[PDB]
Amino acid sequence: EYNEILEWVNSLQPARVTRWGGMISTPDAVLQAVIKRSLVESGCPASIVNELIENAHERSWPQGLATLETRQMNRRYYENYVAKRIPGKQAVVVMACENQHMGDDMVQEPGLVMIFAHGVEEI
Template structure:
């Protein structure tokens, strides 16, 4: 799995050759005790069949393998190697450490991505350009896009159905609770008392506030402000039934007659404050 020795300029030291594949080391690893070096791919595959060093048969595992010393890396990086694309006409000879960079930029690389010259805007491997069909590829893109849209639409439909079912169950539960409270006055009184206790406990946790602008404090918020207020109430520990009632009566059309206009609120502010 290493680099073919014949691709290198000059002689290659045998210490830089993998004992398993007899090629120049690629991504080398050392055995833990004997420190024999192997290509990572070679030694991992070897250990998968036989957990011993191929040279001296000492027992090793893949977890015990370690990187080679810097000096060995430097010796490998100084080697000069011919480009992988020499069979396609590339005559470049580069240092081993810059080979990956060269391959990405090599004009002779058959897999180098190039833009379609026919105008479809796609990028395809160079060796596939002759077989490239703009209409076919665009149709494939449209089909894939439609599949994604259909999948998303189905997910949204499933989500809406789930929400509808949840709302139906909640409504049914409310009706059951209402019926139980109507049929059993004691249970209704107990529920009311528990809700009142929840409100008192919540109120005692809140800091006192000074009302300086009565009309502004209770003026109708828009949808964004209502959402912010609802979130703040929940974060403060407000009982859920109080949050629901406050949000249901947030708009002034649900307020008592004496509060429906700013003028009446200002005229009666002392009455309401007391």
């Protein structure tokens, strides 16, 4: 299981989020399905694909990302996330297994997904 995930994660491109304010904290049902489709096509392991999507919305994000005011205050810390690009989308995955340096209020197992309106580019 570890290698499945490790190889999948390493195969993803490192993402550079240039506009943290462009985050979509409440993606609708269609956008959520779309990001899952992208994860599935990138070879995301079935053992975690559903958990990541659940964690692509506020209601499921860790307290460090829960509210808009908090997100505004914690912007400086987001620069330190080790983020991987979801192929073909303005979205990234933040895996717990490579973000231990962030607080437990900044990430959760197995990881989380952040979708943006724009500003996500390759490093």
